[PDB]
Design an enzyme around this catalytic site. Structure first.
Site, PDB file in Angstrom:
ATOM      1  N   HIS A   1       0.837  -1.223   0.000  1.00 53.41           N
ATOM      2  CA  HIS A   1       0.000   0.000   0.000  1.00 53.41           C
ATOM      3  C   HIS A   1       0.866   1.266   0.000  1.00 53.41           C
ATOM      4  CE1 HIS A   1      -4.419   1.074   0.938  1.00 53.41           C
ATOM      5  NE2 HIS A   1      -3.934   1.789  -0.067  1.00 53.41           N
TER       6      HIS A   1
ATOM      7  N   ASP B   1      -9.916  -0.372   3.438  1.00 51.08           N
ATOM      8  CA  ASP B   1      -8.766  -1.111   4.006  1.00 51.08           C
ATOM      9  C   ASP B   1      -9.061  -1.558   5.438  1.00 51.08           C
ATOM     10  OD1 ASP B   1      -5.985  -1.689   4.841  1.00 51.08           O
ATOM     11  OD2 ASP B   1      -5.299  -0.116   3.477  1.00 51.08           O
TER      12      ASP B   1
ATOM     13  N   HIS C   1      -6.667  -1.498   7.469  1.00 49.88           N
ATOM     14  CA  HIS C   1      -5.691  -0.612   8.165  1.00 49.88           C
ATOM     15  C   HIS C   1      -5.906   0.851   7.782  1.00 49.88           C
ATOM     16  CE1 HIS C   1      -3.784  -4.610   7.688  1.00 49.88           C
ATOM     17  NE2 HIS C   1      -3.442  -4.399   8.977  1.00 49.88           N
TER      18      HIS C   1
ATOM     19  N   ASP D   1      -3.361   3.027   7.931  1.00 50.62           N
ATOM     20  CA  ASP D   1      -2.090   3.429   7.271  1.00 50.62           C
ATOM     21  C   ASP D   1      -1.835   4.915   7.526  1.00 50.62           C
ATOM     22  OD1 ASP D   1      -1.760   0.780   6.453  1.00 50.62           O
ATOM     23  OD2 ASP D   1      -2.465   1.169   4.417  1.00 50.62           O
TER      24      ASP D   1
ATOM     25  N   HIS E   1       4.598   1.024   4.226  1.00 52.16           N
ATOM     26  CA  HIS E   1       3.246   0.649   3.711  1.00 52.16           C
ATOM     27  C   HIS E   1       2.171   0.861   4.790  1.00 52.16           C
ATOM     28  CE1 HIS E   1       3.668  -3.335   5.613  1.00 52.16           C
ATOM     29  NE2 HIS E   1       4.825  -3.493   4.944  1.00 52.16           N
TER      30      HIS E   1
ATOM     31  N   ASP F   1      -7.529  -1.703  -0.781  1.00 54.47           N
ATOM     32  CA  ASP F   1      -6.635  -2.764  -0.279  1.00 54.47           C
ATOM     33  C   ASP F   1      -7.499  -4.026  -0.198  1.00 54.47           C
ATOM     34  OD1 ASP F   1      -5.045  -4.419   1.428  1.00 54.47           O
ATOM     35  OD2 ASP F   1      -4.093  -2.629   2.344  1.00 54.47           O
TER      36      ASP F   1
ATOM     37  N   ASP G   1      -7.187  -6.374   1.581  1.00 58.05           N
ATOM     38  CA  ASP G   1      -7.284  -6.834   2.989  1.00 58.05           C
ATOM     39  C   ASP G   1      -8.490  -6.171   3.665  1.00 58.05           C
ATOM     40  OD1 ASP G   1      -6.559  -4.321   4.126  1.00 58.05           O
ATOM     41  OD2 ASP G   1      -4.470  -4.972   4.514  1.00 58.05           O
TER      42      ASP G   1
ATOM     43  N   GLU H   1      -2.158  -4.922  -2.463  1.00 60.46           N
ATOM     44  CA  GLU H   1      -1.877  -5.910  -1.390  1.00 60.46           C
ATOM     45  C   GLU H   1      -2.326  -7.326  -1.753  1.00 60.46           C
ATOM     46  OE1 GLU H   1      -0.564  -5.542   1.988  1.00 60.46           O
ATOM     47  OE2 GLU H   1       0.316  -3.578   1.492  1.00 60.46           O
TER      48      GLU H   1
END
Ligand SMILES: [Cl-]
Ligand SMILES: [Cl-]
Ligand SMILES: [Cl-]
Ligand SMILES: [Cl-]
Ligand SMILES: [Cl-]
Ligand SMILES: [Cl-]
Ligand SMILES: [Cl-]
Ligand SMILES: [Cl-]
Ligand SMILES: [Cl-]
Ligand SMILES: [Cl-]
Ligand SMILES: [Mg+2]
Ligand SMILES: [Mg+2]
Ligand SMILES: [Mg+2]
Ligand SMILES: [Mg+2]
Ligand SMILES: [Mg+2]
Ligand SMILES: [Mg+2]
Ligand SMILES: [Mg+2]
Ligand SMILES: [Mg+2]
Ligand SMILES: [Mg+2]
Ligand SMILES: [Mg+2]
Ligand SMILES: [Mg+2]
Ligand SMILES: [Mg+2]
Ligand code: NA
Ligand code: NA
Ligand code: NA
Lengths: 287, 292, 289, 289, 290, 290
Positions: free
Chosen positions: C90, C113, C115, C117, C130, C216, C218, C261
């Site tokens: 990412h 996402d 996350h 980030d 990332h 992402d 994820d 990702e």
């Protein structure tokens, strides 16, 4: 003492992609460079060579030309070339860059496939099913004459180990040429120790020996992540012993580990296996 | 002889690996019923309690490992005094310290068949973790931490010339140097592949022919993860179920095994108790079960 | 009928590799180019940008790859083409936003996402870049990352909507609460439903002159997208994600996107690469009827 | 903010017609870092270890283990600490409720389970006591189980809410209808949604001076919680369960809890032990933001 | 050595006993792995005769009716000088296969490739499952209507049997093997001798037979290689050992009939066991890797 | 009302998909015992034999012959005032089921629960698979011998069809759905409205029908819940949504016939899909959790 020169070939060409362009990344992911450095070798990762009837002939020819030139330079510099694949068509480039440096190059073709097809015998036109024939001087002229000489190898200097997928044209050529082939039947009957001792006997007059190891030579249980899996293959233990025996003989002067396919792999089991086999081939011992 | 079963639900070290559940999983695969069906008198002495302690340290969970191994050595000693066969279930391999402490003093030359992916010959100086489960063979040979080496007031428990390691494939440089310096007999996977398990066991029996007793320390991680996935620390390229089954049948026929421990079963990585069932099958073969 | 310009970023940098450099190859393996052509788009595969292999982990290689990506995305936008970036870790959002943000007065960002980030070296327990691209793009972090392409910040906190968050450290939570950033954690998705989350997101970003989707994989549950660099349990379903992409297409607000990702090492027969292509198809107008 | 110390008690009990592997539940839950996760949330946690566990199957052993559990739970409540019990088969609710109910004037119970566990020897196809703990606690069943700790009944049927039921035999159904007990089968969860099920549960139990959560991981679908003693298809999802625990935390009504029936034999790399820890974290106040 | 005979394929979708095990789907799964196309590509003339309808001793009447139809079909194939290849289905179908085959030979040999000896009678069986009794029935030991199928008995003599792969024998079966002197290669003997020597000894032992029937139960293979079987037993023969054995039997030219039984899609993984059954048939009928 | 179970072990088309084993797997999950335990009188009429045999319409003769046998058996069940429950098998069996059923009603409704619309003709089909054509055939669009099965056409009218779960429709199918005004709940509409509203709207839409056939393809469910199907398609209906839908259809009392098709044991996990089919049939016939 020789430096190990690692070259990646992210080539996945043919009628359809099989995912083997990701092979070099997966092998490196299993710490190939650190493991060889930890064994005391000087390791230079030369990175990946860029890759774009006979499927993708121009792209196969261009990538193999770049590989042949890079492998030739490594040998001229007295370094050991270790090529990561990628589809098995990269053996065309590896042998083109290597064979001219030896008077009598031996080749151990460790694979479920003989890769002895021509367009006339191939049910697909896939060049990755033709590299051994091409290197023996049989096939499309531009592939056979790569780097300006042919043939790269003689049929009496080839030993195929693990064969279990040969078509009618390949079988006819093996019988007519008298080529030495250990199918799974002879591995089952003789045992891997005797197969490798006989292979070392057979190639004893060669002044160099190239190992072309396709991870599909191993059983899919042990190497599920390959481009074209074939049931009933060599075990991890038999492959590990074979690499230890080849190291002890001191005959391997170049090697390529090909056809790793992360799409069918299980948590990089096949990438990790490729690294373990390279470590054993380069002298790693359990004790 | 009566079979005395002792469980050691020990899972200590830098991190847990799930092996404290090994004894429960082996019993879940009907160990007691299977041995009783073979005609043995079986006494399940249950599980030895393992001291829990707060959560840096050099030797990981030292106090709890010494305490558990002291309780185990005392129980194993009592079983041998009663002329019964001690069958210990693990648990992490550090329990071999207590099993051998309770057994070795009953023999002048106790042999040890160490069936394992690992040599477990570390000291703190050679261990990157401080895991005592990576040190029991060294401890039993009199090499290592004083309180572990001197358990039950005597040392060493065993002599290096009386040890045979079978299945080794994960040895650090310190362990390799010790094996070469001591002349210890070791069958790595390379030797098993080259000789075959039949020859390996025949040579092992000949090598330990001057021992008055032989302890089998079988770590399920000696088997390949394809056959024994549920282990504390799996290592690729191990002994098959069939080779292990043949080895146990050959050891039974030789009549040399006077004690045994089956350790490192980990239900967390297992597939529907494949490894607990495998442990029971191997115990049945060691105790005389035949296919015909 | 805007041309789609595909750019691959085989970047896998940080304290350790996670296998996401193989993401672009896996997405292409699921026939991304052919699927977009079949939908009637002109598709240009600009190929993969070359990335150098392995406190701030791999700073020089992260900066070098993002510089190449930023100027390539800039050219795509100058040519009135839609940039579709494939990741890769990412951290490539630093380059995608550097090449895009300067073309808009108020660029919106939908950060899809698990996350946030939003880390800096001070809040990151790893030093992984990332885990820092959204903070870097908001002008918070290492000078060379924040000032990529000679301007900062790329985006404003009031123009960001995070969707699917379920792994935020104390520093990231503190910044979210102090900045007033709009965040739909999995708790809000469970309570409101994806339809309401996307309707509220469109309303909140209605004044933006462009909107970048940073997706992402994820963000999806590991059951639906197992092949990701850092899986986190209890994520968005495939059906919720598919509906979200269909609603974003209907709104016509997405002007750039990155799908990042994807990790073949943890994937099951390219389920995650195939999912990435299906979500791109839906974002670009594919309908079930 | 519960400024109370958490007292963890393990019950490695696996009794009945045949073993099911649930004695390993406490070890698997601890393996998923239960103690560390609660400590990192700021709680003071004391692990009291495991109670030793030596027609109605195994009646003497079930009685002996539940007697020790009731005494330990009683001591934790007397010390003003929060009892968190790990199972183990669901028969351990007999001891947990025997040690808890006498401390409240009107104890409520949320029975989160695929099973009602409302059997007696007369209605049970197996004679398993783990299929009888709710009936025993309501004063219905074998005298020695009903009279554990010298009082009965522990709970009143109007103070029970069953959530997740999908395996009720005819005797259990007859009792539920005759008693008027509040039961949310999977059909009601499908029709109402978990938010509404929990809001209704909180309204229904608002007059209770304490509420015990008896969470059987088999209440979750086997896709999300495969490692259970007796899995039953079509259960509650991980996300629905995560939301339910967050809502119970927000209400501040839970005064004790047990997480039971984790079975490593059928689990996949401790997915169910990890799920149990995540649900405990949410029940004790962990938030995603 | 070239067998210039037409192959007659007969399916037996039989799954009888105290409980179903899923083996009735075996013939379909073996065909799904391209059995007919693979044998045709090898140059054989193949006729798929389809499936026979399968309408204290568990399901005795249904086992008898199905085996009666199978025995009549196998008998007609042998009268036509064709090679009968029977697909199972539970191992009780060996009763019908041997009933239609044994009367055509003076000394029929039988290679029983199985984790089980299937030498039970009601007295020695804890289930009453007829699929655990077909070898005993064929030797003339068991329920009269099963033993006398097709009006003759016994079908085979104990000195003409070789069991390969045995690892699940009850006390009654062990007693009978020792009292009869039956030749049995348990997994212990395979581990000790190796499959090459086991097959060499088998061929020598059965050299006076004028026909040899292979009764191959996929459960003879280890569950790691053949997970999709009715009753899996740990520690079996590998795919590679089984492939070598089929190749060696083809080279001997002694196999005159064969059945591949007990494939169970319920426990299989993407038809790995149905595919394995086809590969073993290909090797038995002469396919070579080179 | 007695339940008559008819199995159709049909796996025809360009390539086999393993769905001929669907009826055996559904029965393996105790279908008959479960319905009997609910208090129903159940008759298992067994499996209809499917004739064994590049053509444009794949296996046309065998698909027609099987559907003719199925239509006659379904017709007989309805004449006896019994409820027909058909097990598949590929979805082409809907041609035979609707041919035997529609003539008994003034306006038969059809709930088509499937990932696929199955509205193809040879001109819109890239395979020639008749299992992708049964809804079009039943609407009177397609090959003459399939459309005219049992001597009448069309079986159903487009305004009497509700498709639920659609997520794989080709351009020809989309064009016909839009031009005919057919009611279709794609996964997008199920996600937006929820299954409760979808079924309430479906019941209101088909309220003028005097009978309603449920054609349930297990591939309508997500492969995570029904992995064992002939042609899995990502992003489908959950088991829980399907269970609720079946309970709601039972409470409405409108379902007068049903078929559960496309179960494929080759891709299944320990019969998860066969067990799921039995659970859905139980809910459709009145099973409650309390
Ligand atoms: Cl412990
Ligand atoms: Cl030490
Ligand atoms: Cl040695
Ligand atoms: Cl190794
Ligand atoms: Cl067992
Ligand atoms: Cl009672
Ligand atoms: Cl009998
Ligand atoms: Cl056909
Ligand atoms: Cl047509
Ligand atoms: Cl069921
Ligand atoms: Mg090759
Ligand atoms: Mg190959
Ligand atoms: Mg060890
Ligand atoms: Mg070990
Ligand atoms: Mg991210
Ligand atoms: Mg992320
Ligand atoms: Mg319960
Ligand atoms: Mg329960
Ligand atoms: Mg059998
Ligand atoms: Mg058998
Ligand atoms: Mg359909
Ligand atoms: Mg369909
Ligand atoms: Na994978
Ligand atoms: Na497991
Ligand atoms: Na399966």
């Amino acid at each position: 003492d020789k430096t190990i020169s690692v070259i990646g070939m992210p080539m996945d060409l043919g009628q359809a992609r099989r995912g083997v362009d990701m092979g070099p990344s997966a092998i490196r992911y299993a710490h190939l460079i650190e493991r060889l450095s930890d064994m005391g070798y000087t390791v230079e990762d030369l990175g990946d060579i860029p890759i774009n009837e006979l499927k993708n002939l121009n792209s196969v020819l261009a990538g193999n030309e770049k590989l042949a030139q890079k492998v030739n330079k490594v040998i001229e510099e007295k370094k050991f070339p270790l090529v990561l694949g990628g589809d098995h068509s990269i053996a065309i480039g590896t042998l083109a860059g290597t064979a001219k440096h030896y008077d009598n190059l031996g080749v151990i073709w460790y694979d479920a496939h003989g890769d002895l097809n021509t367009l006339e015998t191939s049910p697909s036109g896939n060049i990755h099913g033709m590299p051994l024939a091409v290197s023996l001087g049989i096939g499309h002229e531009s592939l056979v004459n790569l780097e300006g000489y042919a043939p790269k190898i003689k049929p009496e200097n080839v030993v195929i180990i693990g064969a279990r997928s040969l078509d009618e044209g390949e079988r006819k050529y093996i019988k007519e040429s008298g080529m030495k082939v250990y199918t799974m039947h002879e591995i089952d009957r003789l045992g891997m120790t005797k197969v490798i001792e006989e292979t070392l006997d057979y190639l004893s007059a060669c002044d160099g020996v190239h190992l072309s190891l396709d991870l599909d030579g191993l059983d899919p249980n042990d190497a599920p992540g390959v481009g074209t899996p074939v049931v009933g293959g060599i075990s991890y233990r038999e492959s590990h012993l074979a690499m230890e025996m080849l190291y002890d003989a001191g005959i391997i002067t170049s090697a390529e580990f090909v056809e790793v396919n992360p799409i069918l792999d299980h948590k990089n089991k096949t990438g990790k296996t490729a690294v373990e086999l390279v470590e054993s081939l380069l002298g790693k011992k359990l004790l």
